[PDB]
Amino acid sequence: ETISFSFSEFEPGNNDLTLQGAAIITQSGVLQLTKINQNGMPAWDSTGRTLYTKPVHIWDMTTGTVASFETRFSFSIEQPYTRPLPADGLVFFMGPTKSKPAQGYGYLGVFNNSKQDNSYQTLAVEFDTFSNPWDPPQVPHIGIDVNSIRSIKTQPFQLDNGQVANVVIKYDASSKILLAVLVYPSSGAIYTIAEIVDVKQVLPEWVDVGLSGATGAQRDAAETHDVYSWSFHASLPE
Amino acid sequence: VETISFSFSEFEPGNNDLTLQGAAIITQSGVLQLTKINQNGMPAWDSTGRTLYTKPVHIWDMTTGTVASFETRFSFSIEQPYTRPLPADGLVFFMGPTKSKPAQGYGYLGVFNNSKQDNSYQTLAVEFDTFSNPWDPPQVPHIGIDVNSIRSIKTQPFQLDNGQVANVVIKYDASSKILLAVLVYPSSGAIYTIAEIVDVKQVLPEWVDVGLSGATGAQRDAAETHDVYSWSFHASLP
Ligand SMILES: *[C@@H]1O[C@H](CO)[C@@H](O[C@@H]2O[C@H](CO)[C@@H](O[C@@H]3O[C@H](CO)[C@@H](O)[C@H](O[C@H]4O[C@H](CO)[C@@H](O)[C@H](O)[C@@H]4O)[C@@H]3O[C@@H]3OC[C@@H](O)[C@H](O)[C@H]3O)[C@H](O)[C@H]2NC(C)=O)[C@H](O[C@H]2O[C@@H](C)[C@@H](O)[C@@H](O)[C@@H]2O)[C@H]1NC(C)=O
Ligand SMILES: *[C@@H]1O[C@H](CO)[C@@H](O[C@@H]2O[C@H](CO)[C@@H](O)[C@H](O)[C@H]2NC(C)=O)[C@H](O[C@@H]2O[C@@H](C)[C@@H](O)[C@@H](O)[C@@H]2O)[C@H]1NC(C)=O
Numbered sequence: 001e002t003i004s005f006s007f008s009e010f011e012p013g014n015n016d017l018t019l020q021g022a023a024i025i026t027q028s029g030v031l032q033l034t035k036i037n038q039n040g041m042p043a044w045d046s047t048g049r050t051l052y053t054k055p056v057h058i059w060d061m062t063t064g065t066v067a068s069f070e071t072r073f074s075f076s077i078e079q080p081y082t083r084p085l086p087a088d089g090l091v092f093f094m095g096p097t098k099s100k101p102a103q104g105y106g107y108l109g110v111f112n113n114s115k116q117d118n119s120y121q122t123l124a125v126e127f128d129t130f131s132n133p134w135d136p137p138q139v140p141h142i143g144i145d146v147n148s149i150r151s152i153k154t155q156p157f158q159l160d161n162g163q164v165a166n167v168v169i170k171y172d173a174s175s176k177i178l179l180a181v182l183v184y185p186s187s188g189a190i191y192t193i194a195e196i197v198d199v200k201q202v203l204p205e206w207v208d209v210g211l212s213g214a215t216g217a218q219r220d221a222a223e224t225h226d227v228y229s230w231s232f233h234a235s236l237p238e
Numbered sequence: 239v240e241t242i243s244f245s246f247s248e249f250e251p252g253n254n255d256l257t258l259q260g261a262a263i264i265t266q267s268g269v270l271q272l273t274k275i276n277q278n279g280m281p282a283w284d285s286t287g288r289t290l291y292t293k294p295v296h297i298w299d300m301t302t303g304t305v306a307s308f309e310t311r312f313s314f315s316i317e318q319p320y321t322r323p324l325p326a327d328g329l330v331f332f333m334g335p336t337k338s339k340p341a342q343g344y345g346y347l348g349v350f351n352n353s354k355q356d357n358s359y360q361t362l363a364v365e366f367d368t369f370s371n372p373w374d375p376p377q378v379p380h381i382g383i384d385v386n387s388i389r390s391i392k393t394q395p396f397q398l399d400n401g402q403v404a405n406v407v408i409k410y411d412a413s414s415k416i417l418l419a420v421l422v423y424p425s426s427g428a429i430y431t432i433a434e435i436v437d438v439k440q441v442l443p444e445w446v447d448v449g450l451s452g453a454t455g456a457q458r459d460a461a462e463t464h465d466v467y468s469w470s471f472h473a474s475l476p
């Protein structure tokens with residue numbers, strides 16, 4: 001059982017994408033996850049997401065088989081303000097179908113608190129720009145989140161302000177290895193992170209896949225969270 | 239902490255920190271040509287060359303059972319100038335017993351002696367394979383994770399960007415036992431990833447040598463270049 005999609009760019013109306021919160025697709029084909037003010041500056045106190053309309057079959061209880069998958073997307077985060085510190089980040093997430101945006105700020109529109117809760121049934125790879133109490137001190141950092149905003153693994157990386165980053169996330173069901181890579185063509189910088197994740201005991205049999213972004217809790221604690229392309233592929237062995 | 243690291247932004251003829259074996263030479267221009275390049279600028283077949291960092295690396299300690307985490311990065315280019323016969327054989331990053339000499343060439347890439355898996359090899363390698371031997375998947379080129387055998391425990395096909403520079407990142411996390419590798423072609427923006435579980439305690443000796451090896455084919459024109467422009471490495475033993 002296979003499923004996949006590829007957006008080399010986005011266009012206003014694409015029935016295959018559900019926009020939630022402040023998320024909008026510009027005429028230029030850019031998915032702005034968080035609000036961009038009239039004057040071009042990123043707005044604080046903003047949360048937006050996008051979900052692929054079709055659900056994905058990740059695993060099956062009867063057969064006990066698990067799907068391997070991969071997703072890729074390009075994004076740019078620009079932190080224009082001299083102060084205060086920018087926030088909060090963007091993230092790729094997989095979880096229960098028909099989900100609506102959760103809490104913003106450090107929860108990135110995906111979680112509701114900083115608890116360890118198996119009921120979240122969510123897996124996510126974050127690109128975190130603000131260090132919250134539950135975070136490592138280094139920001140930005142990539143993070144692998146399993147049923148909690150408290151990453152089971154993190155990797156610091158240097159932002160190349162306003163430049164486009166290419167992300168590759170892949171999950172191999174056989175080894176249970178979830179890996180993510182971030183590349184900045186502008187500088188050639190490459191960052192990687194990987195950890196074991198048993199999706200069988202984390203995600204529901206069917207899930208929705210999406211992208212979410214959020215700006216800060218105080219004036220000007222913000223940055224852009226723009227996405228230019230997004231592709232996904234999953235194959236469930238029978 | 240037991241740490242070791244080196245970084246060659248380019249290579250200099252005479253650098254006492256590198257041991258050149260086989261056909262390997264360092265050009266005045268600072269390029270490490272693993273396999274012989276003829277005076278007419280064309281790569282010679284039946285060529286095998288390697289380079290080893292002169293200092294041994296402490297990967298693990300049997301007394302305490304501690305295992306080091308490490309990472310290596312290098313840039314290389316493989317140019318296949320002939321339309322016939324098929325190009326061969328590839329290049330590889332390998333870690334194994336110190337004071338080793340080039341092994342069999344061709345598809346064994348100067349690191350192994352035959353296709354059998356043998357603990358006596360005590361070698362871990364990440365290959366960039368260009369010719370499909372009987373023990374290989376049909377697709378070439380491909381990245382391969384080699385544990386005591388030229389027959390990879392995991393492979394990932396990738397499209398060559400003929401003659402262009404590829405950036406490689408290989409990292410081992412002792413806590414998760416995850417060995418990952420990434421190849422990026424700035425020229426096209428292509429990104430490839432591969433990862434698998436590897437218990438280095440049961441594979442490598444406490445102290446190892448790290449090196450790069452390249453080899454061309456067993457018949458005329460079954461050749462390609464195996465040039466390396468830079469190489470860095472770092473390991474941390476708790
Ligand atoms: C790929 O294949 C190569 C070549 O076969 C191999 O490298 C050779 O390994 C052999 C070991 O099997 C090396 O030979 C030894 O050399 C030392 C140093 O002089 C001697 O002390 C050894 O003799 C003792 O041990 C013998 C048992 O192995 C025993 O029979 C002797 O009586 C003595 O106690 C041994 O010398 C040989 O002894 C048998 C004689 O008939 C023979 O003429 C004599 O050579 C040999 O030098 C290596 N050759 C080269 C060029 O490297 C690769 O791996 C080996 O690499 C070695 C450097 C070392 O690290 C070995 O542990 C390793 O197995 C093979 N590649 C891999 C990694 O699999
Ligand atoms: C995250 O916060 C959400 C908002 O409160 C929770 O969803 C809400 O779940 C209620 C039932 O638990 C349901 O009545 C509400 O309609 C729904 N949304 C609203 C408007 O409140 C969410 O709850 C989780 O998901 C639901 C579907 C159930 O499975 C709950 O048991 C879950 O807790 C919150 N998620 C978590 C894990 O806290």
Ligand SMILES: OC[C@H]1O[C@@H](O[C@H]2[C@H](O)[C@@H](O)[C@H](O)O[C@@H]2CO)[C@H](O)[C@@H](O)[C@H]1O
Nearest residue numbers: 087088105106130132215216217218221
């Ligand atoms: O500053 C960005 C940062 O804000 C945190 O929330 C702060 C808030 O900004 C501050 O004015 C108030 O006094 O305390 C809050 C914390 O309790 C967010 O939590 C963080 O995610 C960022 O958005």
Ligand SMILES: OC[C@H]1O[C@@H](O[C@H]2[C@H](O)[C@@H](O)[C@H](O)O[C@@H]2CO)[C@H](O)[C@@H](O)[C@H]1O
Nearest residue numbers: 326327344345369371454455456457460
């Ligand atoms: O052709 C490149 C390819 O050669 C293989 O070796 C061949 C050899 O080329 C051929 O002339 C001979 O008859 O049989 C050999 C075994 O198939 C190498 O094994 C392979 O690695 C490449 O180098």
Ligand SMILES: [Ca+2]
Nearest residue numbers: 106128130132
């Ligand atoms: Ca955070």
Ligand SMILES: [Ca+2]
Nearest residue numbers: 345367369371
């Ligand atoms: Ca081969």
Ligand SMILES: [Mn+2]
Nearest residue numbers: 128135143151
């Ligand atoms: Mn975080």
Ligand SMILES: [Mn+2]
Nearest residue numbers: 367374382390
């Ligand atoms: Mn191979």
